[PDB]
Amino acid sequence: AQYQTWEEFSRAAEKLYLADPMKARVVLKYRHSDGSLCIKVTDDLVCLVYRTDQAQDVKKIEKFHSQLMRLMVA
Amino acid sequence: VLLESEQFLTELTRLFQKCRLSGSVFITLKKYDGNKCLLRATDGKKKISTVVSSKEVNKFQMAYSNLLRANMDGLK
Numbered sequence: 001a002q003y004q005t006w007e008e009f010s011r012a013a014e015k016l017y018l019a020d021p022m023k024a025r026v027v028l029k030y031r032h033s034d035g036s037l038c039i040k041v042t043d044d045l046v047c048l049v050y051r052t053d054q055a056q057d058v059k060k061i062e063k064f065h066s067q068l069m070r071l072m073v074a
Numbered sequence: 075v076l077l078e079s080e081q082f083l084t085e086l087t088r089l090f091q092k093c094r095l096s097g098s099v100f101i102t103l104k105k106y107d108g109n110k111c112l113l114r115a116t117d118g119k120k121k122i123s124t125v126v127s128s129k130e131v132n133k134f135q136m137a138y139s140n141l142l143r144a145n146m147d148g149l150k
Contacts, residue, residue, distance in 0.1 A: 014117065018139055021105055022105065024104075024105075025102060025104040026102070026103050027097065027100055027101065027102045028100070028101035028102075028103075029088075029098050029101075030098060030099050030146055031093075031097075031098045032090075032093055032094045032095075032097075032147075033093075033094075033096050033097070035147065035148045035149060036148065037146060048106070051102060051150060053148035054148065054149065055146075055147055055148030055149055055150060056141075056150070057145055058146050058147075058148070059143065060099075060140045060144075062139050062143055063139075065101075065103065065120050065137055065142070066135055066138070067105055067114075069103055069111060069126075069131070069135065069138075070135075072103060072104070072105045072109075072111040073109055073110070073111045073126065073127070073128050073131045074109065074128075
């Protein structure tokens with residue numbers, strides 16, 4: 001569930017999105033007081049979470065969010 | 075509240091500036107038709123919703139990416 005890795009969480013999220021587009025969703029939460037960023041994607045059958053913001057990964061998180069938006073708008 | 079793409083950026087910027095000392099900003103992306111996409115921002119007290127269509131997805135994308143990278147900082 002909480003795959004605290006990279007290049008595996010994103011692929012699983014893409015597979016979940018391809019499983020069903022109408023129910024797939026992702027929620028982004030940022031906490032400045034603790035300096036923590038968390039990513040959660042819910043498929044209404046499975047849910048994945050990702051703590052440990054790792055500020056170096058801001059670009060690869062925002063790019064993933066925009067890439068999901070592009071597929072949601074295509 | 076349903077808001078256009080322009081004022082949504084400054085509303086999200088003000089939301090980011092509001093929760094600097096306490097609070098979390100929630101951003102949700104979901105495919106809404108009735109192609110269009112739905113994006114909502116809510117810290118717990120104020121809710122802002124915006125719909126983005128294929129006619130302005132490119133214009134909204136760069137601004138959203140720059141705003142998202144501008145106001146997020148964690149651990150080095």
